[PDB]
Amino acid sequence: AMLPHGLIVSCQALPDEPLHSSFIMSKMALAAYEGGAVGIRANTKEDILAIKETVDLPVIGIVKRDYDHSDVFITATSKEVDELIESQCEVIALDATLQQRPKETLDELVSYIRTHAPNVEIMADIATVEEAKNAARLGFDYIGTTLHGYTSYTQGQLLYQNDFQFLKDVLQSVDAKVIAEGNVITPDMYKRVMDLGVHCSVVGGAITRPKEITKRFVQVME
Numbered sequence: 376a377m378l379p380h381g382l383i384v385s386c387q388a389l390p391d392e393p394l395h396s397s398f399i400m401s402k403m404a405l406a407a408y409e410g411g412a413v414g415i416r417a418n419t420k421e422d423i424l425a426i427k428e429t430v431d432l433p434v435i436g437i438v439k440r441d442y443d444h445s446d447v448f449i450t451a452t453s454k455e456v457d458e459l460i461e462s463q464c465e466v467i468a469l470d471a472t473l474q475q476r477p478k479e480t481l482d483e484l485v486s487y488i489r490t491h492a493p494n495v496e497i498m499a500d501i502a503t504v505e506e507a508k509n510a511a512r513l514g515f516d517y518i519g520t521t522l523h524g525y526t527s528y529t530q531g532q533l534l535y536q537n538d539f540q541f542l543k544d545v546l547q548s549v550d551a552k553v554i555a556e557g558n559v560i561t562p563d564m565y566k567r568v569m570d571l572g573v574h575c576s577v578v579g580g581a582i583t584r585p586k587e588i589t590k591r592f593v594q595v596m597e
Contacts, residue, residue, distance in 0.1 A: 376552070377433040377465040377496050378517065378575055381413035382565065383554070385579030386426065389418070389439065393586050397425035403583045405429040416468075416577055423462040435498055436464030442477035446527065449500050452478040453487050460492045467492065471499030471510045472522060485513045498554070502526040504544050511549040519554040519577065520545065534558055539571060546572050560591075 384407030388394040394403070397419075404415045404426045416435045417423045423436050438455035441448050450456060450469035459467045467488055471481055479487060488497055499510035502522035510518050523541055524532040534541060534557045546553050555568035556577040568576050580587040 376516065377414075378435075378552075379413045380569075381575055382407075382411065383414040383416055383435070383575050383577040384412040384582050385416035385556075385577050386422070386583050387416060387418040387437075387439075387579060388583070392584075394583070397422045401425040401429040404432065407582065408432055413575070414466075416579070417464065420458045420462040423459075423464050427463070433465035435466040435468050436462050437468045437500075444475075445477045446474045447472065447476045449522075450484075451476055453484065454478075456484065456488055456491075460495070464495070466496045466498050466517065468498040468500055468519070470522065471501050471513070471515065471518075472503075472506050472526060473509065474526070482513065485515075500556075501545075502529045504541075504548050507545045507551075507553075508548050511551045515551060517552045517554050517574065518545070518549060519556045521556040521577070523557055525557070535564060539567060542568060542571055542573065 386400040386403040400422045408430045414433045417426050418437050418439050423434055426434055436459040437450050438458050439448055440455055442451050447470045496516040498517040498519055499515040500519050500521045501507050501510055507518050520534055523529055523534055542555055552574035554575045554577055555573045559565055559576050559578050560581040565576050
């Protein structure tokens with residue numbers, strides 16, 4: 376397995392966020408590497424290639440792209456997969472909910488990846504326990520929780536709620552490698568999720584989003 380136990384840093388500034396920049400994301404990933412991260416989440420082929428220039432950490436690649444008439448935006452179709460194959464990231468991740476996709480179904484997209492990029496591992500971005508089970512059924516190499524609370528049917532939910540109850544349920548329903556992702560904001564939460572038995576945790580905003588860290592300081596004053 377490409378991803379060792381440990382901390383993954385997500386370096387995925389989108390257009391219109393302050394640090395949107397292949398170049399800046401390559402230096403964020405260099406910082407995460409120097410601080411002891413064991414991998415990187417990255418978005419778009421161009422950011423993946425920039426990152427692969429500054430670090431040798433295995434990278435988890437997505438392409439975030441909206442399609443009309445679909446709620447699936449994380450590596451929705453084989454178009455995004457083909458970009459990621461050219462990028463040579465070690466792990467291709469994709470929304471592995473069962474919401475309607477623009478083109479291939481999720482089943483078909485998994486088969487597509489195994490067919491055309493047999494050397495790459497796959498990772499399932501999921502929002503629910505049933506989705507996690509289905510991803511295990513599809514043979515995903517890793518199962519992440521980034522979509523928990525970020526779908527229309529999980530509004531309100533936060534990974535940490537009720538002492539990480541959702542994560543507990545996920546770990547008990549599958550035997551696949553489970554990745555805690557989404558609002559892991561303190562070293563203490565990170566410790567907690569590793570204690571609960573996840574393989575890795577992914578941290579984004581608490582490391583690579585100074586706007587969001589800034590807002591957390593400023594709001595104690597409200």
